[PDB]
Amino acid sequence: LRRKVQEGRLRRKQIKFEKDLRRIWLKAGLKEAPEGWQTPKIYLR
Amino acid sequence: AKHLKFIARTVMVQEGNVESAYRTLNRILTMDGLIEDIKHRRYYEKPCRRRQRESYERCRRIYNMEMARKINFLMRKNRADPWQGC
Amino acid sequence: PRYELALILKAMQRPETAATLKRTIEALMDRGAIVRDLENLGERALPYRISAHSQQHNRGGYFLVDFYAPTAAVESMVEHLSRDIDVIRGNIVKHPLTQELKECEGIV
Amino acid sequence: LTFQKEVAERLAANTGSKQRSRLSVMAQYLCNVRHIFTIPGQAFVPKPEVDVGVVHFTPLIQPKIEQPFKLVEKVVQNVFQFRRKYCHRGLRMLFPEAQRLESTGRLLELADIDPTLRPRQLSISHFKSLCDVYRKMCDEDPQLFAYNFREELKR
Amino acid sequence: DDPPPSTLLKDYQNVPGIEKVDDVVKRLLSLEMANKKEMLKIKQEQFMKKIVANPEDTRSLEARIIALSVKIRSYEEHLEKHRKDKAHKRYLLMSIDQRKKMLKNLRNTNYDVFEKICWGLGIEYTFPPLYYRRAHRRFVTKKALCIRVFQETQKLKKRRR
Amino acid sequence: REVLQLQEEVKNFITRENLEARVEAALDSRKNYNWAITREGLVVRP
RNA sequence: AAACUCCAGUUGACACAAAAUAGACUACGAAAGUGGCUUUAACAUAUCUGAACACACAAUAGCUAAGACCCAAACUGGGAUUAGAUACCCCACUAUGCUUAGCCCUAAACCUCAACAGUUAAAUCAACAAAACUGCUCGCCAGAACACUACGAGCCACAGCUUAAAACUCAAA
Ligand SMILES: [K+]
Ligand SMILES: [Mg+2]
Ligand SMILES: [Mg+2]
Ligand SMILES: [Mg+2]
Ligand SMILES: [Mg+2]
Ligand SMILES: [Mg+2]
Ligand SMILES: [Mg+2]
Ligand SMILES: [Mg+2]
Ligand SMILES: [Mg+2]
Numbered sequence: 001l002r003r004k005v006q007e008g009r010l011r012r013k014q015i016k017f018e019k020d021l022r023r024i025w026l027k028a029g030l031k032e033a034p035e036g037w038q039t040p041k042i043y044l045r
Numbered sequence: 046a047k048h049l050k051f052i053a054r055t056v057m058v059q060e061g062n063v064e065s066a067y068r069t070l071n072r073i074l075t076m077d078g079l080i081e082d083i084k085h086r087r088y089y090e091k092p093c094r095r096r097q098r099e100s101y102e103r104c105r106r107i108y109n110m111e112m113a114r115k116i117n118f119l120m121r122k123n124r125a126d127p128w129q130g131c
Numbered sequence: 132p133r134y135e136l137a138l139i140l141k142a143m144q145r146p147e148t149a150a151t152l153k154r155t156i157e158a159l160m161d162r163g164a165i166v167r168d169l170e171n172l173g174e175r176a177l178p179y180r181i182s183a184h185s186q187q188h189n190r191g192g193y194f195l196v197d198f199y200a201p202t203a204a205v206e207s208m209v210e211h212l213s214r215d216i217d218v219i220r221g222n223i224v225k226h227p228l229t230q231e232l233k234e235c236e237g238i239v
Numbered sequence: 240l241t242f243q244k245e246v247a248e249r250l251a252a253n254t255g256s257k258q259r260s261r262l263s264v265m266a267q268y269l270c271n272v273r274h275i276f277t278i279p280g281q282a283f284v285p286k287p288e289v290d291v292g293v294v295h296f297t298p299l300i301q302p303k304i305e306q307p308f309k310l311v312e313k314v315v316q317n318v319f320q321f322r323r324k325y326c327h328r329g330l331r332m333l334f335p336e337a338q339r340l341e342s343t344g345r346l347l348e349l350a351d352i353d354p355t356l357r358p359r360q361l362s363i364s365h366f367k368s369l370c371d372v373y374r375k376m377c378d379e380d381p382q383l384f385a386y387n388f389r390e391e392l393k394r
Numbered sequence: 395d396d397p398p399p400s401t402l403l404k405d406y407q408n409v410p411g412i413e414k415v416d417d418v419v420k421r422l423l424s425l426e427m428a429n430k431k432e433m434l435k436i437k438q439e440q441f442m443k444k445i446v447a448n449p450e451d452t453r454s455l456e457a458r459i460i461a462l463s464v465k466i467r468s469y470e471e472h473l474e475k476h477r478k479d480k481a482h483k484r485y486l487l488m489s490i491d492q493r494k495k496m497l498k499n500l501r502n503t504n505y506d507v508f509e510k511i512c513w514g515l516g517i518e519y520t521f522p523p524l525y526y527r528r529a530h531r532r533f534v535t536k537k538a539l540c541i542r543v544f545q546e547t548q549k550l551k552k553r554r555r
Numbered sequence: 556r557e558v559l560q561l562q563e564e565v566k567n568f569i570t571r572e573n574l575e576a577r578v579e580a581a582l583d584s585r586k587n588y589n590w591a592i593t594r595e596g597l598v599v600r601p
Numbered sequence: 602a603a604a605c606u607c608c609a610g611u612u613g614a615c616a617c618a619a620a621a622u623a624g625a626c627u628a629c630g631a632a633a634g635u636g637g638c639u640u641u642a643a644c645a646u647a648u649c650u651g652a653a654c655a656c657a658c659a660a661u662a663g664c665u666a667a668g669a670c671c672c673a674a675a676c677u678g679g680g681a682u683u684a685g686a687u688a689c690c691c692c693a694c695u696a697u698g699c700u701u702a703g704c705c706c707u708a709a710a711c712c713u714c715a716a717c718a719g720u721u722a723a724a725u726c727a728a729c730a731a732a733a734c735u736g737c738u739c740g741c742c743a744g745a746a747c748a749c750u751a752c753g754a755g756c757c758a759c760a761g762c763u764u765a766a767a768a769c770u771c772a773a774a
Contacts (some may be wrong), residue, residue: 002760003255010759017532024536025543029550034542042531045759046613047179082621089673103625132429134640145582152578156569163426165418166569169581172588182614194581199427205640222639257760320676321696323663332695357664359760389678389694409558418565419558430642453647465645472642480658481644484631487657488645495646526655530755 010043017042054079133167133226134205136196138212139181139219141188142174148192151217156196158211162204170195177219184216191219197226240294247274247292259359261319265312268303268363270296303363306370310377310384314370319358326361327354332388333373346372397436399426404435430468438464445514446507455500456507462493463515493517 018039025033054074058066074080090098136159140151156166172193181188200208205223212221242250245258250266251274252258266272278291304311318329327343334342347354350368352361377384406412406423415423425433441460442449451457469486473479497519501508512519569577591599 001253001255006759017535021536021539024539025546028543028547030543030546034539034546037539037542040531040535042535045757047181049179078622086621099624106625132427149575149578149582152581153574156574156578160571165422165427167564168567169569169577170586171581171584173585187614195586199422201426202429202641209640224639255760316677322676324696325665328696387678387694392694406558412558415558415562416565418568419561422561422565423558458647462645468643469645476642479643481630482642484657485643485645488631490645491656492646523655526652528654528755532755 014041014043132202133197133199133229134223135226136198136208137222137224138194138196139177139191139221140194141186141217141219142190142192143217147217151215152194154215155212155218155221159196159198159200159204159208162200162207162211164198164200164204164208167197167199168195170197181219183219188219240296241278241291242294244277244290244292247277247294250274250294254362255360257359260322261315264315264361264363264366266296268299268311268366270298272296304367304370306367306374310374311366311370313384314373315366318361318366318369322358324357325354326352326356326358329358330369333386334383335386336388336391342376346376349375397425397433397440399424401425401436403428403432404439434464434468437467441514445510455496455503456511459493459496459500459511460515462489462496463517465489466493 021039022033054070056066056070056073071080136155138155140148143151152169156169159166172195174190174192176190177188181191208223209221212218215221246262248256248258249260249262251272252260252263256263273295275293275295278293280287280289280291283291313333317333318326320332321329327347330346331339331343333346346369350365350372352365352369356365400420402412402420402423403425412423421427425436438461439449441464442457445460446454446456448454452461466486466489469482469489472482473486476482497508497511497517500511501519508519511517587601589601591601593599
């Protein structure tokens with residue numbers, strides 16, 4: 001059960017990272033992400 | 046195995062005195078440390094225990110020698126009283 | 132540097148021993164060695180039985196080859212001494228004379 | 240029943256509890272096991288150096304593995320004999336040496352088990368699949384169930 | 395490149411009449427028949443003659459830098475073959491740090507000698523990083539996105555104007 | 556002095572020309588490296 | 602008692618294992634560590650201090666692939682044992698101890714003495730430990746427990762390792 005909670009928290013952390021990254025280019029004025037940009041999954045093996 | 050036999054740890058019997066030859070062989074093996082090695086090699090002695098034992102034996106020898114030297118040095122004084130009465 | 136090769140050769144007759152000595156010295160020179168002297172210690176019973184090249188030896192001829200060789204030759208020479216079938220045991224050491232005899236004042 | 244604290248936890252260890260071992264699966268595919276409370280060692284009149292746990296067993300209406308007890312015992316013991324290694328290292332000791340590599344792969348393929356799963360991470364359904372495939376193998380080979388790799392290594 | 399094997403030892407190079415000896419003597423007194431340390435000494439002497447104004451003064455910063463550079467080269471050659479020698483990896487890294495410190499001192503003290511040393515010994519001086527922090531995965535990813543977004547914004551502004 | 560000593564010593568080195576002669580001479584020779592020491596510190600050669 | 606009797610004794614051939622005596626020595630290395638022989642490389646710095654995170658290392662245990670296997674041995678079997686036997690004795694045999702290439706990064710990792718420089722005059726000095734101090738620098742600590750914990754963050758680790766609190770409670774520790 002500690003595995004499930006930890007994996008859910010890792011998903012939440014990845015979502016937070018993506019959301020901050022999105023905030024950056026939205027504030028920069030870009031309607032979409034830079035061409036070819038894909039947020040990597042850095043919190044999963 | 047690869048060595049010549051009847052040279053190492055070999056004692057000759059004199060006048061059929063087998064007992065004296067056996068006891069001399071025992072003395073040789075004891076003073077060469079072979080007996081202690083055989084007795085110690087029956088079971089494995091852990092390295093830390095071996096180190097502690099060696100240190101204890103060395104320091105016991107040193108302390109005993111120092112105490113014996115002190116006693117021998119102060120034994121010269123032990124004699125009849127030359128100023129008895131006073 | 133200066134090296135000493137201690138060679139324990141098979142107990143053979145004079146012609147075979149001479150040929151083996153020539154072969155060893157030729158290998159030394161082929162690897163770049165300058166040989167100083169070849170020295171005979173004699174044929175004697177080995178301190179123990181030595182099994183070399185699928186043959187057991189109890190006696191052998193002791194020889195000393197003093198030479199100067201490059202540092203790279205030594206290893207190569209060792210390999211050759213492993214393949215020669217008439218060598219019971221060959222070992223290269225730094226020549227004892229090169230080591231400095233440091234002087235001592237006695238026991239403190 | 241009362242057990243020692245460690246044994247009670249091993250009996251009541253979930254998939255991914257450090258006390259997960261043979262006893263956990265062995266008790267849990269047959270019984271609902273509940274480690275209720277623990278009694279410290281100071282409470283026993285000659286005081287031991289260990290604690291005491293109280294475990295409650297309720298037999299399960301539908302056992303989670305429909306197999307003979309001794310077969311499941313062998314499978315679980317061979318799985319858990321190397322508790323920190325990959326599971327296949329434990330399953331491969333169920334078969335003779337000659338057919339070891341082939342039979343281990345066959346068992347894992349038919350059972351649909353990831354070889355990189357460790358013993359402590361294997362749920363009771365994985366053990367169900369492994370036990371079923373091993374039962375089929377033993378039915379196809381009368382003398383497989385009597386194999387003891389230590390006796391083979393004796394020779 | 396190393397000195398040729400026929401090079402004579404530093405100890406036997408100024409002996410009078412050393413050109414009048416037998417070829418066997420020349421080989422015996424050469425680098426071919428000595429350990430690596432003599433060859434390193436010859437390298438150090440060559441560097442000193444090439445770079446420093448007074449090749450005899452070994453107590454100056456430039457001479458020490460040359461000696462440590464020779465030692466660093468020797469450690470690199472050793473570690474090329476001995477990949478798992480942790481002690482000599484440590485020695486190489488510590489020697490590089492010490493040479494960097496000496497180079498900083500020389501640059502702050504004597505720029506002409508510093509430049510001559512850098513050219514002669516093939517050393518490219520690098521200034522230290524200002525901050526020492528871990529560049530973890532999140533940080534590098536976010537930095538790369540920031541650079542990409544800046545480039546895109548530059549393109550958009552260029553198009554606008 | 557060392558260079559001169561090496562010069563004089565090189566004349567006696569073994570070469571490809573004198574390999575046979577020196578090998579046979581060695582085979583006709585024996586050297587002893589053994590010697591003993593007494594309690595008084597005196598060398599006793601064999 | 603089980604076990605073996607393809608057993609045991611002499612003799613001969615024969616390791617990818619670990620290294621009597623020396624060593625009553627106290628050496629090498631930054632530490633961890635290092636005690637069979639030969640050879641090749643080789644043990645930084647001509648001020649000092651300077652990091653949980655930067656850069657390189659870290660006993661034993663543990664994990665990936667391949668390999669070796671004498672002996673030892675967690676577990677696993679069997680033998681013998683009272684009246685809940687011996688966990689402890691005996692036999693057999695695994696992971697592991699070994700090598701190659703990667704991980705993991707913890708120890709009573711301790712001389713339980715932070716690094717350099719200096720002094721022995723003082724009152725020597727709470728106690729014990731290991732005689733008492735000075736100068737300078739970095740690191741760390743401010744009642745107990747909660748807590749080698751929770752959360753956050755990072756990590757070849759996915760339970761792991763590092764950093765590390767708060768609420769309630771007590772007059773103590
Ligand atoms: K200690
Ligand atoms: Mg420093
Ligand atoms: Mg800090
Ligand atoms: Mg480690
Ligand atoms: Mg290991
Ligand atoms: Mg084994
Ligand atoms: Mg072990
Ligand atoms: Mg410090
Ligand atoms: Mg924690």
